[PDB]
Design a protein around this nucleic acid. Sequence first.
RNA 1: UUAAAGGAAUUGACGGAAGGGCACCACCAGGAGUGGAGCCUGCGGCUUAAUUUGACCAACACGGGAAACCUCACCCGGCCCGGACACGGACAGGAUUGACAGAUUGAUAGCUCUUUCUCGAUUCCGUGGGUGGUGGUGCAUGGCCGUUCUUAGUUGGUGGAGCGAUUUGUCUGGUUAAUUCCGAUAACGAACGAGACUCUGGCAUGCUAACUAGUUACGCGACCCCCGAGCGGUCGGCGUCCCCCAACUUCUUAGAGGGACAAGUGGCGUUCAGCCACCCGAGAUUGAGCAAUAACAGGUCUGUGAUGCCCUUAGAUGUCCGGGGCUGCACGCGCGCUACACUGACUGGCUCAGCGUGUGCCUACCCUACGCCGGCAGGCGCGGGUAACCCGUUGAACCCCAUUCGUGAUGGGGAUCGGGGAUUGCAAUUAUUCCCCAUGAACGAGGAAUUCCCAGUAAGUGCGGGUCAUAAGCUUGCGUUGAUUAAG
Lengths: 52, 67, 98, 55, 170
Amino acid sequence: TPCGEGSKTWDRFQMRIHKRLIDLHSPSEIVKQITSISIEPGVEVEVTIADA
Amino acid sequence: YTTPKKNKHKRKKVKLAVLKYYKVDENGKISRLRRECPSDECGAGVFMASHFDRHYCGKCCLTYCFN
Amino acid sequence: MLMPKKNRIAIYELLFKEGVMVAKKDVHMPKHPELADKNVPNLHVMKAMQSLKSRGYVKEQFAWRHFYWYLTNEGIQYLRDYLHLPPEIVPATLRRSR
Amino acid sequence: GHQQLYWSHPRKFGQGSRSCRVCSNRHGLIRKYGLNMCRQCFRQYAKDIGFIKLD
Amino acid sequence: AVQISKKRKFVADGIFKAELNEFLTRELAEDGYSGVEVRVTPTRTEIIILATRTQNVLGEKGRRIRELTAVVQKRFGFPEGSVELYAEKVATRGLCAIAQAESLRYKLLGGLAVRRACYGVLRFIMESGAKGCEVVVSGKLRGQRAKSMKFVDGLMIHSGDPVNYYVDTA
RNA sequence: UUAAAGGAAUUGACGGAAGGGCACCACCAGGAGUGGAGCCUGCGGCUUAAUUUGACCAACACGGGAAACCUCACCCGGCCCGGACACGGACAGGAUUGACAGAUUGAUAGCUCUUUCUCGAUUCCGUGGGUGGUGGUGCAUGGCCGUUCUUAGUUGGUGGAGCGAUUUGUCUGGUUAAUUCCGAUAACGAACGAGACUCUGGCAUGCUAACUAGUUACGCGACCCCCGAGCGGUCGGCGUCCCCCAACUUCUUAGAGGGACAAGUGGCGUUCAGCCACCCGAGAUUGAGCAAUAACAGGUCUGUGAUGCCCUUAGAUGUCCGGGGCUGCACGCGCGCUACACUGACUGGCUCAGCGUGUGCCUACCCUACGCCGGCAGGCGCGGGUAACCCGUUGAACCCCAUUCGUGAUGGGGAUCGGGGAUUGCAAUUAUUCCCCAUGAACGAGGAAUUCCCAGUAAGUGCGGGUCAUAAGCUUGCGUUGAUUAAG
Ligand SMILES: [Mg+2]
Ligand SMILES: [Zn+2]
Ligand SMILES: [Zn+2]
């Protein structure tokens, strides 16, 4: 409630993010053709380092 | 909304209409009437102030001791 | 406000060479991040762009909390004349992209 | 003015400094996760952040 | 700076989407704004408007993009030219509820009656292939006590989860 | 003396009017108990310089408000302009800033004053002007929330009945959690609301997958072994993605899909809708989210640059700064903890979990392992963790076994209260918190009345978020232990 008056309500905004995982052994110039292949706003993919 | 003890008014300044701080003699001769401010930016640019026994630079804020 | 004249040049030189700046409505904030070099405070950036609205020269709205700014047509030509600048030094609103 | 005692209080720990991000409520805000919104405004921006309703 | 945790990545870009929504609603109120969509790239990033009138959101040679992108750059901290907006004409102008509510704003701020304004926007959506739609105009009408008009027209669901994506509220 | 009184039909609301249904915000049957006692907290009152303020089932642990100052409006006092822009004069032969000394003050506020330098047209003054407002008015409003209202209701079109308001549709019944169905029929055909749907809870020895999860197998290491053997027992000891010097998914994580539908068998009823148990089965009512039409002069202008009007505008209701109050006590009221023991309490052993948070563009300060100093609170160095990667198999409490105490206002109770020790911080004083020793009050099961709830449910029991520098007797989630009574 934007005020303090009511009858004691409590809403539960819950946000649930999922995650998956994939290994590679590959050289990392063609890591660039892993990235730029979907525009896709609904993904958050991350690039792990290729120093090994 | 009365306030009878009368809070103080605005800071009115010196407003005295006399500078004249270079006295002229012997058909043109220069006199520093006050000592100049010895700071590391304003050598012979501005005047170090003169109280009746102490001196203090009005800009660079170093002081001359009580003598 | 105070209008220190070497510092109004500091805020006019960026408000002219781009038509944007991003002040944030909190006046007791010690430093302006976009200028960052000529020791200017957050407060005058309001209190000079108040003066640029009220002549009729700049135009603004209000964010969540930030200020944005856009130059009018009258504000463009007056500020190059204010800073002694020719009609070849131009603001970044005419054409900069390709 | 006169910078020596102008802003002399510690605006630090405690609710003198924690302001709302939206337009500065200083009564009952949410420091969790860097949201920093007023709780009255969390129903204005529930669907837009990603805090959808009970599912 | 050094990177930060994953639960605060997701409220970072969440609060990024909420803020330029609020600014562009104030910025593009008179042009039929109707939301934005973001795309994050590790290059020049990519945003679009959904404007009804793609005229006024453009300038001459793109002025009201290039200063509408620079404040996006110079507020959040995007680097030197890594973000770009685009105008885009929203399909079926009378089907997203935000757009004509911004356009019936100026049917009330234009100076018409509310009853000419409400029925006019009500028939428009209907003839734009609608299944059911309603408008409530509430507030201080002719008189002193604020009483409210509603113009429910057709059939409309209200409950369950399908009042999330069969409907759009404004 | 007065603009209605009076007639008849209609819709609502009501009746200590009849019929028929439902609810633990209702009862019966029962337990937990509050009201009795201590206390923490909230509201009234009184008192005060002020004890700022809103609300009186749907107010009274509420303003996500557990305030030391900040926040903060209220009180006492000191500064600042952060009163844009337009009008004229004062601005070049002396407009406007700043500041050391000192009697200045709460004050290293140049506030004022004596003295006197600096700043550079920025301004100051006069007048019209925005402006800011936790200033009024929620009975001018928007958004939102609350409620009758979680109970089963609401509506057109089109016909029929009626001068007409309106009505049938929306029904006698049978049944249903339910206008939910059957059927009955001047009504026929539809929309919401219910349901469906989303989440969640439960079975997948099926499917796909695992150096951030594991199991099993093996080689090594170490102990034990009647005896002395080990394919013997123990190991969260080590290694088997490091370029194979092992496979695999039961347990962990999810992802799709499968799974229950009242299907089968009987008794019922118009062999209609359906109800009653039984058999198979993990399960034969998992629990909540959303939630109609029409409304209340419900609350909030103190979340909001959502906001109309009024008020206030520099001797400011603007705003900074220090202190006081928001906490004061002959009294009453409401939530809530501990109790009032022997089913207990001590002391020492033995012991098993789930939910989840964690280092910042601003804002600088997080989770902690370990090591070493302290009888405790703690202190220093060393690390890991932006996290299924570290805290961490989260060794929680209750419990259990082992000893001490025996119905004693007692080792039950720990209020009250003295002194000392540390941590937090700009500041602990009106006790922030934590620890120690000492002090040891009522309280011996509770008047009239009243709440909450029926299956992992009430309850005992702890942990975790949120407020957080310090902070939980509050709230919101978690798991453990786990019921008596009910099908009306
Ligand atoms: Mg507000
Ligand atoms: Zn100098
Ligand atoms: Zn008043």
